[PDB]
Design an enzyme around this catalytic site. Sequence first.
Site, PDB file in Angstrom:
ATOM      1  N   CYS A  47       9.964  29.952  18.588  1.00 29.37           N
ATOM      2  CA  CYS A  47       8.781  29.388  17.895  1.00 29.37           C
ATOM      3  C   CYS A  47       7.592  30.383  17.884  1.00 29.37           C
ATOM      4  O   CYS A  47       6.845  30.359  16.915  1.00 29.37           O
ATOM      5  CB  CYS A  47       8.317  28.092  18.552  1.00 29.37           C
ATOM      6  SG  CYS A  47       7.854  28.211  20.296  1.00 29.37           S
ATOM      7  N   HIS A 195       5.595  24.259  22.432  1.00 22.17           N
ATOM      8  CA  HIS A 195       5.802  24.774  21.059  1.00 22.17           C
ATOM      9  C   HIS A 195       4.596  25.521  20.620  1.00 22.17           C
ATOM     10  O   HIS A 195       3.440  25.155  20.951  1.00 22.17           O
ATOM     11  CB  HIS A 195       6.142  23.550  20.147  1.00 22.17           C
ATOM     12  CG  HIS A 195       6.665  23.907  18.792  1.00 22.17           C
ATOM     13  ND1 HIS A 195       7.802  24.635  18.632  1.00 22.17           N
ATOM     14  CD2 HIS A 195       6.160  23.671  17.546  1.00 22.17           C
ATOM     15  CE1 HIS A 195       8.009  24.829  17.329  1.00 22.17           C
ATOM     16  NE2 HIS A 195       7.035  24.234  16.657  1.00 22.17           N
ATOM     17  N   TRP A 212       4.693  23.697  11.474  1.00 23.21           N
ATOM     18  CA  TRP A 212       5.361  23.703  12.759  1.00 23.21           C
ATOM     19  C   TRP A 212       6.405  24.760  12.901  1.00 23.21           C
ATOM     20  O   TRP A 212       6.938  24.980  13.977  1.00 23.21           O
ATOM     21  CB  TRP A 212       6.059  22.335  12.990  1.00 23.21           C
ATOM     22  CG  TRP A 212       5.116  21.154  13.036  1.00 23.21           C
ATOM     23  CD1 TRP A 212       4.983  20.161  12.078  1.00 23.21           C
ATOM     24  CD2 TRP A 212       4.208  20.803  14.092  1.00 23.21           C
ATOM     25  NE1 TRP A 212       4.042  19.268  12.472  1.00 23.21           N
ATOM     26  CE2 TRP A 212       3.555  19.634  13.695  1.00 23.21           C
ATOM     27  CE3 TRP A 212       3.855  21.393  15.335  1.00 23.21           C
ATOM     28  CZ2 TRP A 212       2.591  19.007  14.474  1.00 23.21           C
ATOM     29  CZ3 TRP A 212       2.882  20.745  16.136  1.00 23.21           C
ATOM     30  CH2 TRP A 212       2.281  19.565  15.703  1.00 23.21           C
TER      31      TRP A 212
HETATM   32  C1  LIG Z   1       9.099  27.126  21.337  1.00 21.24           C
HETATM   33  C2  LIG Z   1      10.140  26.727  20.351  1.00 21.24           C
HETATM   34  O1  LIG Z   1      11.115  27.505  20.033  1.00 21.24           O
HETATM   35  O2  LIG Z   1      10.067  25.575  19.844  1.00 21.24           O
HETATM   36  C3  LIG Z   1       9.698  27.953  22.393  1.00 21.24           C
HETATM   37  O3  LIG Z   1      10.400  26.952  23.154  1.00 21.24           O
HETATM   38  C4  LIG Z   1       8.689  28.546  23.319  1.00 21.24           C
HETATM   39  O4  LIG Z   1       8.199  29.698  23.167  1.00 21.24           O
HETATM   40  N1  LIG Z   1       8.200  27.841  24.435  1.00 21.24           N
HETATM   41  C5  LIG Z   1       7.226  28.490  25.343  1.00 21.24           C
HETATM   42  C6  LIG Z   1       6.013  27.624  25.576  1.00 21.24           C
HETATM   43  C7  LIG Z   1       5.191  27.339  24.321  1.00 21.24           C
HETATM   44  C8  LIG Z   1       4.803  28.651  23.614  1.00 21.24           C
HETATM   45  C9  LIG Z   1       3.934  26.557  24.599  1.00 21.24           C
HETATM   46  C10 LIG Z   1       7.914  28.902  26.647  1.00 21.24           C
HETATM   47  O5  LIG Z   1       9.133  29.105  26.692  1.00 21.24           O
HETATM   48  N2  LIG Z   1       7.161  29.094  27.832  1.00 21.24           N
HETATM   49  C11 LIG Z   1       7.843  29.522  29.084  1.00 21.24           C
HETATM   50  C12 LIG Z   1       8.101  31.019  29.261  1.00 21.24           C
HETATM   51  C13 LIG Z   1       9.179  31.591  28.329  1.00 21.24           C
HETATM   52  C14 LIG Z   1       9.865  32.928  28.590  1.00 21.24           C
HETATM   53  N3  LIG Z   1       9.064  34.149  28.533  1.00 21.24           N
HETATM   54  C15 LIG Z   1       9.402  35.278  29.435  1.00 21.24           C
HETATM   55  N4  LIG Z   1       8.680  36.379  29.418  1.00 21.24           N
HETATM   56  N5  LIG Z   1      10.443  35.148  30.264  1.00 21.24           N
END
Ligand SMILES: *[C@@H](C(=O)O)[C@H](O)C(=O)N[C@@H](CC(C)C)C(=O)NCCCCNC(N)=[NH2+]
Length: 254
Positions: A47, A195, A212
């Site tokens: 996302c 997201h 979205w």
């Molecule tokens: C969003 C999507 O594909 O719908 C995707 O799940 C995502 O990026 N989620 C993020 C949180 C959102 C941006 C608020 C997420 O995964 N956060 C946790 C850390 C992810 C991994 N990053 C590293 N550097 N390991």
Amino acid sequence: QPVVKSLLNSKGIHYNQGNPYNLLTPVIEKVKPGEQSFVGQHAATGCVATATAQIMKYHNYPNKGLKDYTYTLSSNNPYFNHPKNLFAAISTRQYNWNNILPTYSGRESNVQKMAISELMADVGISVDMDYGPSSGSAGSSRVQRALKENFGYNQSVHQINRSDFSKQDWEAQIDKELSQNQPVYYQGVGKVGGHAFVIDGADGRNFYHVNWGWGGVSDGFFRLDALNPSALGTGGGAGGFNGYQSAVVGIKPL
Ligand SMILES: *[C@@H](C(=O)O)[C@H](O)C(=O)N[C@@H](CC(C)C)C(=O)NCCCCNC(N)=[NH2+]
């Protein structure tokens, strides 16, 4: 709150995270124990990458990438053998914005499909994407750094966190971006996960237009404290991206 018609819809811009956006993400190597196979399928773009790429297509910028990026996946990712290093030669890129089309329905040329897939893969690498059937990044803090350092956007690019502002001052910053024709990267977390997405319009009654990143699904007008698309949630209940919110604003070319 001024009325601003959806900036991305006005330009036809509707990206998502599967094909033909993900043709250059890493190919999944392993079956996660307890899960069905995604082996041999490309990972989701993420996302965070899809939101950022839609904002970049709004600007058709940069024509030339500025700086390469390299990183190593977490050893906890069950979809790849480790260590797994990823690299994007962004400094050598000449992005042809006539081939990176505003949207895709399948009849486009392989060149056009690869052009958006290359942008998506470069953007996700620049934000340290944890690739999988779903793919995740930290988001805002990485996005603001990548847009300036790797893609040559203006020093005006920066993250703002919801907790640092009153509601009035937070919405006033969003409105100012929209008044300047600048879509805003936005994210949040809650009971249907986390997201990232784009705020690109406003209706004058304190609702904002959201894209979205699902191809069009659930796009429409939302309050920024009730970012609750009905495409998510199983079992009939409520949930949305209303916690720990942040945005990247100032997004415009050098
Ligand atoms: C969003 C999507 O594909 O719908 C995707 O799940 C995502 O990026 N989620 C993020 C949180 C959102 C941006 C608020 C997420 O995964 N956060 C946790 C850390 C992810 C991994 N990053 C590293 N550097 N390991």
